Design a protein around this ligand. Sequence first.
Ligand SMILES: O=C(O)c1ccccc1O
Length: 119
Amino acid sequence: YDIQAWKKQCEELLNLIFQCEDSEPFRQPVDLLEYPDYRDIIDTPMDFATVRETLEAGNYESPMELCKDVRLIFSNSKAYTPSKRSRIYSMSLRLSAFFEEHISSVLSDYKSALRFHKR
Ligand SMILES: O=C(O)c1ccccc1O
């Protein structure tokens, strides 16, 4: 029932993601010189370094907020891809499955901690 435990759990999950080869296209903001039409399709760029920095700055109030930003990295890849069989989009799908399988317990534990506190 540790209400604060999600933060270190998310830091550790981000460490695992940064080690994953599938995260390489998503570690830093999409290079706008390499993809000049990116902002014509994507309204809100997001990347894992931004997520980590937001977390480290103390600017997430809950793991659900972090999860919304990570999910935005994946939805941006899905929206920008010219093909559902592209290399970068295929990496995003694997990385998304890995993230979802690991974040589930972080969210569950946080929500359980809040409920225990309210009780
Ligand atoms: O699928 C792609 O080719 C792609 C390229 C740049 C950024 C995100 C992407 O999904």
